[PDB]
Each structure stands twice: as C-alpha cells, then as structure tokens.
Amino acid sequence: AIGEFMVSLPRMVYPQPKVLTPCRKDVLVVTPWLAPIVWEGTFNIDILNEQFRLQNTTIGLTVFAIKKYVAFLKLFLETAEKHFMVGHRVHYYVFTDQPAAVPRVTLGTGRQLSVLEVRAYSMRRMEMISFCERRFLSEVDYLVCVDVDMEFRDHVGVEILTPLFGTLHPSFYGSSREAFTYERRPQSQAYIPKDEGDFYYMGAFFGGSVQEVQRLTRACHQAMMVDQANGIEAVWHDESHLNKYLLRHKPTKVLSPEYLWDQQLLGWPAVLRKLRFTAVPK
Amino acid sequence: AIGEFMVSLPRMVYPQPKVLTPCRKDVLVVTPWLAPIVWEGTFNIDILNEQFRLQNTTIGLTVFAIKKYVAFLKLFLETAEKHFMVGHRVHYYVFTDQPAAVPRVTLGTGRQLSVLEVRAYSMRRMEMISFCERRFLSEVDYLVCVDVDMEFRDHVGVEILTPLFGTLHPSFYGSSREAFTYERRPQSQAYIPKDEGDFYYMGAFFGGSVQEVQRLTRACHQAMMVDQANGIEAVWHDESHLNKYLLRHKPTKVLSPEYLWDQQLLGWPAVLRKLRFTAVPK
Numbered sequence: 194a195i196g197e198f199m200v201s202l203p204r205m206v207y208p209q210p211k212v213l214t215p216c217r218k219d220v221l222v223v224t225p226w227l228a229p230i231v232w233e234g235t236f237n238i239d240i241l242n243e244q245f246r247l248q249n250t251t252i253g254l255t256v257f258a259i260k261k262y263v264a265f266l267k268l269f270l271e272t273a274e275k276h277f278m279v280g281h282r283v284h285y286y287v288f289t290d291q292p293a294a295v296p297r298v299t300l301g302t303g304r305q306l307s308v309l310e311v312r313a314y315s316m317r318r319m320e321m322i323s324f325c326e327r328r329f330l331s332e333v334d335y336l337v338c339v340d341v342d343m344e345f346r347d348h349v350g351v352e353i354l355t356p357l358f359g360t361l362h363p364s365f366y367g368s369s370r371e372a373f374t375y376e377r378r379p380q381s382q383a384y385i386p387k388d389e390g391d392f393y394y395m396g397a398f399f400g401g402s403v404q405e406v407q408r409l410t411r412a413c414h415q416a417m418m419v420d421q422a423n424g425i426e427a428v429w430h431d432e433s434h435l436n437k438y439l440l441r442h443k444p445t446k447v448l449s450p451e452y453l454w455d456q457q458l459l460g461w462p463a464v465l466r467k468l469r470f471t472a473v474p475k
Numbered sequence: 476a477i478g479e480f481m482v483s484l485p486r487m488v489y490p491q492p493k494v495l496t497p498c499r500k501d502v503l504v505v506t507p508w509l510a511p512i513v514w515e516g517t518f519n520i521d522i523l524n525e526q527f528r529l530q531n532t533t534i535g536l537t538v539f540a541i542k543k544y545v546a547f548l549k550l551f552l553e554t555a556e557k558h559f560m561v562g563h564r565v566h567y568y569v570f571t572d573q574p575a576a577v578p579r580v581t582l583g584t585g586r587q588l589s590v591l592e593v594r595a596y597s598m599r600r601m602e603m604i605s606f607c608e609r610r611f612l613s614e615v616d617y618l619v620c621v622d623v624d625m626e627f628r629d630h631v632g633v634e635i636l637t638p639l640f641g642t643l644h645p646s647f648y649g650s651s652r653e654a655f656t657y658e659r660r661p662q663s664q665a666y667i668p669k670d671e672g673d674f675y676y677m678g679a680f681f682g683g684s685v686q687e688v689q690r691l692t693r694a695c696h697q698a699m700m701v702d703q704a705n706g707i708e709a710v711w712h713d714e715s716h717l718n719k720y721l722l723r724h725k726p727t728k729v730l731s732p733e734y735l736w737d738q739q740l741l742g743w744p745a746v747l748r749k750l751r752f753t754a755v756p757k
C-alpha cells in the first residue's frame with residue numbers, strides 16, 4: 194500500500210546518526226528541492242526495509258525484450274532475483290514479441306512474472322506503460338522501468354522508492370548543464386535551453402508510484418506524438434522527453450550512478466562505492 | 476492542496492546543482508531513512524516556493540498563549556508576519572484563556588488569524604490540537620505547532636513542509652544518544668532505552684500534514700493519559716512523548732537548530748548560518 198496508516202516501527206539497535214558527521218562529504222546527497230540523492234552510506238537499509246515491509250509494499254518492474262533483446266532476459270532476471278527488492282513483493286512485467294523465448298527463471302517466494310506480448314516495430318515503451326494503466330494500479334504500489342541489456346551486481350532495494358525518481362546518467366554526472374545532450378531545437382517538445390537543467394537523467398532507469406509513473410509516461414508519449422506530427426524526432430528519443438519532464442516535475446529522489454553504470458566504458462571511480470546495475474555488452 | 480495533480484514548473488534560471496560539490500560538508504543533510512535535514516545552503520527557495528504556490532498551499536500555525544504568556548503574542552505574531560511563509564496562505568490559530576489580551580496585529584494579504592478560547596489549567600496542547608481536528612482538515616494543508624515565547628528573526632518557509640517533521644533541540648544536536656534526556660523509566664509510555672534514539676527533538680516546533688499532525692497529537696495525548704492513569708509523568712512532559720513518537724514514526728524532514736535556537740544560552744556557532752526562530756527571555 195502507499196499513503197495508508199503507518200504502524201509503529203519495532204525497537205531497533207543501529208548506529209546513531211551524528212549531526213556533525215556527514216555520511217558522504219565527496220558528493221551532493223540532497224537536491225536543491227530537498228530530494229535525497231541515493232548513494233551508498235546515506236541510508237540504513239534495515240530502517241527502510243522495516244518501513245516498507247510494514248506497508249506490505251509491492252514493486253512492479255517493467256522490462257522490454259523485443260527482437261534480439263530477448264537474449265538479455267536470462268541474466269537480467271536471474272540477477273534481479275539475487276539483488277532487486279529481495280524480501281519484498283515483486284511483480285515482473287516482461288513485454289516481448291516472442292513469449293516463447295522468455296527464459297524459465299526460478300523465482301524466490303513472493304515474486305511473480307507476467308509475460309505480455311506486444312508488437313515488434315525504444316520510444317513506444319511510454320505508450321505501453323501508460324495499455325497497462327489499470328493492471329498496474331490494481332497489482333503494485335510502485336513501478337520501476339528499466340532497460341533489459343543490463344545486470345544487477347549489488348543491492349537495489351527500497352531506498353529507491355518514492356513518488357517519482359530518475360537516475361543520473363553515468364557519463365554526465367560531473368558535466369555542466371551546457372554540455373548536457375538535451376534536445377536543443379525549440380521546435381521539439383523536449384527542448385531545454387542552455388541555461389536550464391538540473392541533471393542529465395538516463396532513460397534506462399526511472400520509476401515511482403504507479404500514479405506518478407503513469408503521469409510521466411502519459412506526458413512523454415503525448416509529447417512524442419506532438420513531435421511526430423511536427424516532423425521532428427528528439428536527439429535521444431524517449432530520454433530527451435524524460436529529461437524535459439523531470440526538469441518541469443522535479444523527482445522526489447534521484448538515484449546516483451551506482452544505479453546505472455557501464456564499467457567497460459567508465460571503469461570504477463572513487464565516488465562509486467558500489468556498482469549496482471550495470472550495462473551488458475550490446 | 477496536498478497530493479493533487481501537479482502542474483509543470485515554469486522556466487527558471489538558477490545555479491546548477493553540482494553532483495561533485497556538496498552544499499554543506501560540515502553537517503549531516505539527510506537522515507539514514509532518507510529524510511532531508513534542513514540547513515541553510517541545502518535548498519533553493521525559489522524552486523520550493525514555485526512548487527508550493529502551484530498547489531495553493533495553506534499553512535496553519537498553532538500557538539498557545541495561556542495566563543501570563545499572552546505577553547509574548549505581539550512579538551511572536553509581528554515577527555511571523557515578517558518571516559513565516561511570506562507569499563503563502565497562512566492561518567494562525569491562537570489558543571488563549573484571555574481573548575481580549577490578544578494584540579491587534581496587522582496581517583499581510585492572504586493571512587488570517589482566529590482566536591480560540593480555552594480553559595486555563597503545556598501537556599494539554601496535544602488534546603486541543605487533536606477539538607480542532609475537523610476545523611483544520613477543512614481549512615489548511617499543513618499544520619505547524621510552536622511555542623509562543625519565541626520570535627522569528629529570519630526566513631521560515633515552505634522548505635519545512637512535508638508529511639511529518641521534528642526539529643533538533645539546540646542543546647543536544649552534538650550529543651550522543653545515551654546523553655539525550657529521553658524518558659528512561661520503563662513504566663512510562665515515553666520510555667526509550669539507552670541504545671535507541673536518532674535525535675533529541677524539541678517539543679517547541681513540530682508539524683506536518685494535517686493528517687500526520689493529528690496522528691501524532693492523538694498518539695501523544697493517548698500515551699500521556701496512560702501515564703496519568705499509571706501515576707507517572709514523563710521527565711519532559713509532552714516533549715518526552717513527542718520523542719517517543721518520532722523514534723517509532725520517522726519524520727519525513729528534520730529541521731536543523733536554525734529553526735529553534737536560544738542565542739542567550741548558546742551563542743551563534745559556526746554551524747549556524749542563520750538563526751531563524753529564537754527564544755525570548757522567559
């Protein structure tokens with residue numbers, strides 16, 4: 194459930210947070226609109242697990258595996274079982290043009306997988322997320338929407354959950370805003386001028402409550418349709434639109450690049466204590 | 476309104492948040508349950524003002540002025556007009572045994588004051604807040620509950636608003652938990668053992684959404700009634716109970732001691748960039 198009566202936490206023994214000791218001094222851990230930026234060392238997962246289990250939280254995870262990308266499902270799902278929301282209720286929604294190619298993956302208790310068949314034609318995921326509206330409202334509390342050509346290597350848990358989140362793109366977290374690859378043509382709905390922008394968010398990992406995710410995906414789909422009607426395609430497709438949306442609708446948490454990393458491309462810099470969810474070649 | 480459809484922010488020009496530059500390196504700016512701790516330098520008030528004005532947010536402020544404490548109202552209210560939620564809708568609720576002693580204070584536009592008469596007997600504020608339940612639900616989005624023997628000296632605005640907040644007590648923000656003056660007798664409902672506790676919150680400044688404030692004040696009133704029936708009075712009265720509640724129900728923001736300070740007692744230490752709401756002698 195979200196927003197419902199919250200019962201008392203039980204007694205817990207854990208280290209006292211100390212006001213005059215910051216968790217992390219090397220990174221920004223809160224945005225200027227007071228949204229946490231989630232890095233290792235900023236959260237006590239035991240407190241968070243208690244809070245979310247007491248609400249019997251169910252997390253939906255959407256993933257698209259169309260054409261050759263069905264090959265990525267086995268590693269994606271098997272590593273999700275090891276690292277994604279373990280202990281919580283999880284419902285995977287696998288959208289594919291080849292239901293028979295979905296691997297048979299053994300799931301832990303309280304976890305389920307639904308195969309949803311779609312047509313084969315990246316930019317139409319927004320539309321499909323916004324066919325499933327009624328399904329998701331009835332079945333899960335939060336939605337997490339990710340790319341499939343990825344693997345989990347470390348904990349990805351309830352610390353991410355919030356009404357609306359985006360993830361810092363691993364190539365741009367140190368960049369100034371004029372360097373961000375936002376859509377820069379005023380003719381596109383995704384247009385952001387050079388003096389605007391907080392962050393460059395990656396289209397590969399966003400989420401939130403079902404209501405907020407439906408609002409985002411609806412808005413991005415509508416904006417993409419407008420661009421299509423006007424004969425323009427944003428430079429980075431759905432990611433350009435996601436960036437425009439999150440500029441105008443500030444996320445209530447921001448995930449650090451721990452949550453979307455490419456080790457082949459970018460190595461393992463000092464600012465990353467954990468590499469949680471990472472690109473697979475292709 | 477709270478929780479309703481959020482329209483898009485307009486274009487804004489402001490400094491880019493930089494991921495590899497923390498706002499503040501000298502203090503903890505997020506709790507281990509991912510609640511912001513509100514210090515100067517952590518928020519862009521222009522972004523927050525936009526967000527809350529777009530929801531037409533109304534803030535209720537409750538204050539009790541019983542017996543000799545009516546003398547504190549003039550400075551309290553006049554300085555609130557200068558510094559508290561300026562630009563937003565505000566409704567003051569002044570609870571007093573002497574309605575005629577309430578000073579005639581000139582209010583800015585969009586601000587109103589109601590005088591509520593009560594009986595003269597600190598611990599019964601929880602009960603009165605939890606007589607007013609229907610009134611507050613109909614009239615305001617957030618409630619802020621404060622002591623009267625105080626003055627505003629600097630900005631106190633929408634950066635504080637969240638479902639549930641407490642404020643760090645100015646005498647104890649650097650203390651280890653065993654030193655906190657929690658109720659330590661197991662016979663009291665307010666009991667917290669020496670190995671538990673995040674922070675020591677002051678009873679003089681707490682708040683949240685109307686729903687969460689009613690939950691807190693109801694729970695504290697019920698706990699205080701149990702203690703009374705058992706012949707025990709918590710060491711710091713309502714503040715002991717507030718501390719127990721916020722241990723078991725984590726606040727979604729924590730205000731730094733900028734928001735409750737005593738300059739006569741504690742001076743102006745380096746960690747405080749602003750002194751916003753401060754004790755008046757008596």
Ligand SMILES: O=c1ccn([C@@H]2O[C@H](COP(=O)(O)OP(=O)(O)O[C@H]3O[C@H](CO)[C@@H](O)[C@H](O)[C@H]3O)[C@@H](O)[C@H]2O)c(=O)[nH]1
Pocket residue numbers: 256257258259260261262263315316339340341342395396397398429430431432475
């Ligand atoms: O033939 C395809 C092509 C794409 N996909 C799905 O769409 C996702 C995105 O495509 P992918 O090739 O992974 O794109 P990338 O270049 O790795 O990622 C960029 O492009 C994506 C789509 O615009 C955004 O989500 C990312 O943020 C952006 O970095 C894939 O993971 C799949 O889930 C398929 O299922 N089949």
Ligand SMILES: O=c1ccn([C@@H]2O[C@H](COP(=O)(O)OP(=O)(O)O[C@H]3O[C@H](CO)[C@@H](O)[C@H](O)[C@H]3O)[C@@H](O)[C@H]2O)c(=O)[nH]1
Pocket residue numbers: 538539540541542543544545597598621622623624677678679680711712713714757
């Ligand atoms: O005769 C009185 C006594 C108290 N009050 C009200 O109750 C508040 C609390 O009393 P006060 O004397 O200000 O208590 P303090 O010792 O300054 O504050 C401590 O006691 C309060 C009451 O337990 C808590 O709110 C504070 O966190 C705690 O620091 C006052 O500000 C008034 O609003 C009156 O109106 N008339």
Ligand SMILES: [Mn+2]
Pocket residue numbers: 340341342397475
């Ligand atoms: Mn990819």
Ligand SMILES: [Mn+2]
Pocket residue numbers: 622623624679757
């Ligand atoms: Mn006082």
